[PDB]
Every structure is written in structure tokens, then in C-alpha cells.
Amino acid sequence: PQITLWKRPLVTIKIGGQLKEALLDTGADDTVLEEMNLPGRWKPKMIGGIGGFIKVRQYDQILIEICGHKAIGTVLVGPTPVNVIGRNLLTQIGCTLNF
Amino acid sequence: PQITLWKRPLVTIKIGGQLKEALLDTGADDTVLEEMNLPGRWKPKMIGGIGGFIKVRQYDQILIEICGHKAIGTVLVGPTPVNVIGRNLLTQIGCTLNF
Ligand SMILES: CCOP(=O)(COc1ccc(C[C@H](NC(=O)O[C@H]2CO[C@H]3OCC[C@H]32)[C@H](O)CN(C[C@@H](C)CC)S(=O)(=O)c2ccc([C@H](C)O)cc2)cc1)OCC
């Protein structure tokens, strides 16, 4: 599909057996999602943007489905104000910017 | 152009007559540039990111050329971690997401 940017590029994702809403975000290197109690091991990380840094849990090789497109990769979980699908997963669904 | 996402989508912009590098950021509503000198009036503003809120200088109706494509719109200047081009200008240059 083609998504215009008049509004935020929010889509439904499926992760950890749950449906969530997340932004398709070309400005994010990696994917950052709201607190969810996912099974398995994880590594602490700190990630920063406007306003400073937050603490997240890094989970590797997580299955995520984005608009029906399946992807597998790292997800960072913590108290983010917004869920972002970053480039690590957008590449896997073949997403480009075009103008 | 068609821009894939294996690398950061960094492009050259021209603002205030000077060239700079900036990131095309679909997860940003607004365009935020690191501290710089820009002519004309501005107004204090607050903007929120992953890490909380920061103070910026709001410059309205600013000419800016992004990867060869002209825009005229609002530019926020302040302590962003990196120069980001947000949706207010991405729409102007006809940028969509495609997968
Ligand atoms: C309930 C509402 O919460 P809220 O309003 C904040 O909401 C939002 C918070 C973040 C975003 C996405 C964020 N956009 C953003 O900063 O945009 C600003 C300017 O335009 C406004 O529009 C939206 C906010 C304002 C950007 O796309 C992605 N970022 C990096 C970018 C800045 C370049 C380094 S990142 O997220 O920092 C990030 C860092 C590191 C990683 C891993 C390591 O790779 C992944 C992601 C969208 C909405 O207030 C909170 C106090």
C-alpha cells in the first residue's frame, strides 16, 4: 500500500499474541514498544531522543506482523509514549520513502 | 527518489541559505533542527519526544529545500539529538511510505 503523511502513519501490529497500534517510523533505527510482559530473556538498554533517554528491555528474534507482513527481529520494550516500528523491521516488510 | 531503509534516510537540506544534513522522519509530526542561526522573528515553544519535553524556537513560514524539493513551513530549533524532517514538510514534498 501507499501511506500518505497528512496524519500519523499508525498501523495495527501483532506481537506476543497481542494486537497493538504502532507508527511506521523511518526516524527510528530500532523498534520500541509499550511495556509488555514478553516471555524470554532480555538485556537492559537506554535509548534517547528528544527530551532525553529512557530505560527499555531488549528482546531479540521477536515475531511481529505489521499490516499482514511478517517480520522477525529486535524489539525494545519500556515506558515509551508511542509505539514505533523502526527501520530494523520496516526493511523486512519492504517499506520505502518515495517523493 | 525511492529511498530504502537499510541506512538512515539522511538527505541534504538548504535552510537560511546554508546546507545541512537531516533525517526524513515519519514518526515526527514536526521538523526540529539542532541549534543554528535563522533570520526573522520566532516564538518560544515546547515539543515532546520519547524522553520528555524540550524548549525550542519556532520559526514560521521558513523556506527549506529538501533533497531538491522545496517546502515552506514551520521549523523548530533546539536541542534535538539530530536534525529531523517531520510530516509537516514531508507532505509538502510529496513523500509517502510504500510497501
Ligand atoms: C502520548 C504522546 O507522547 P509525547 O507527545 C512523545 O510522543 C512521541 C515520541 C517519539 C516519537 C518518534 C520520534 N518522533 C519525535 O521525536 O517527534 C517529535 C518532533 O515532532 C513531534 O511529533 C512526535 C513527537 C515530536 C522519532 O520518530 C523517533 N525518534 C528518534 C528521532 C528523534 C531521531 C533520533 S525516538 O522516538 O526518539 C527513538 C530513539 C531511539 C530508538 C532506537 C534506539 O533506535 C527508536 C526511536 C513520536 C511521538 O510526549 C512525551 C513527553
Side-chain angles (χ1 to χ4, degrees), chain A residues 42 44-62:
Chain A
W42 53 273
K45 190 179 175 84
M46 278 176 74
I47 57 166
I50 286 171
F53 280 74
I54 61 173
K55 301 171 189 173
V56 298
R57 307 194 297 287
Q58 167 180 347
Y59 292 87
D60 297 319
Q61 290 306 100
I62 302 295

Side-chain angles (χ1 to χ4, degrees), chain A residues 8 23 25 27-32 45 47-50 76 81-82 84, chain B residues 23 25-32 47-53 80-82 84:
Chain A
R8 297 179 174 233
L23 291 177
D25 192 355
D29 296 341
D30 286 307
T31 295
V32 183
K45 190 179 175 84
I47 57 166
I50 286 171
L76 308 173
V82 55
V84 295
Chain B
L23 180 77
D25 184 354
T26 51
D29 304 342
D30 303 308
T31 291
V32 193
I47 61 173
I50 202 174
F53 284 82
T80 176
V82 306
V84 298

Side-chain angles (χ1 to χ4, degrees), chain A residues 1-40 42 44-62 64-99:
Chain A
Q2 177 169 103
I3 300 180
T4 62
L5 297 171
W6 294 115
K7 67 180 177 69
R8 297 179 174 233
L10 287 168
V11 301
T12 304
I13 68 170
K14 178 167 70 164
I15 173 177
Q18 288 195 303
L19 298 187
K20 307 292 201 182
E21 296 294 292
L23 291 177
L24 303 175
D25 192 355
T26 63
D29 296 341
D30 286 307
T31 295
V32 183
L33 303 174
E34 62 185 276
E35 177 60 34
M36 43 182 51
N37 190 37
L38 297 174
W42 53 273
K45 190 179 175 84
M46 278 176 74
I47 57 166
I50 286 171
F53 280 74
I54 61 173
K55 301 171 189 173
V56 298
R57 307 194 297 287
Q58 167 180 347
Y59 292 87
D60 297 319
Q61 290 306 100
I62 302 295
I64 309 193
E65 192 175 295
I66 302 149
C67 272
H69 289 73
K70 288 172 160 51
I72 180 142
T74 289
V75 176
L76 308 173
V77 174
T80 177
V82 55
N83 297 337
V84 295
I85 310 302
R87 291 190 297 99
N88 70 311
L89 301 183
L90 295 170
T91 54
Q92 296 187 35
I93 68 172
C95 191
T96 56
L97 289 163
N98 305 76
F99 54 102

Side-chain angles (χ1 to χ4, degrees), chain B residues 22-40 42 44 46-87:
Chain B
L23 180 77
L24 308 176
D25 184 354
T26 51
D29 304 342
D30 303 308
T31 291
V32 193
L33 305 184
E34 303 186 275
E35 166 69 19
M36 68 171 296
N37 294 307
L38 267 181
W42 58 268
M46 306 297 290
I47 61 173
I50 202 174
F53 284 82
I54 63 167
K55 303 163 63 167
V56 294
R57 290 155 26 222
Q58 175 171 335
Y59 291 88
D60 284 324
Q61 211 164 322
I62 294 292
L63 280 58
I64 176 172
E65 182 159 13
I66 303 159
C67 206
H69 291 252
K70 303 189 161 60
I72 301 175
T74 294
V75 175
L76 309 185
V77 177
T80 176
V82 306
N83 297 329
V84 298
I85 305 311
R87 293 189 293 99

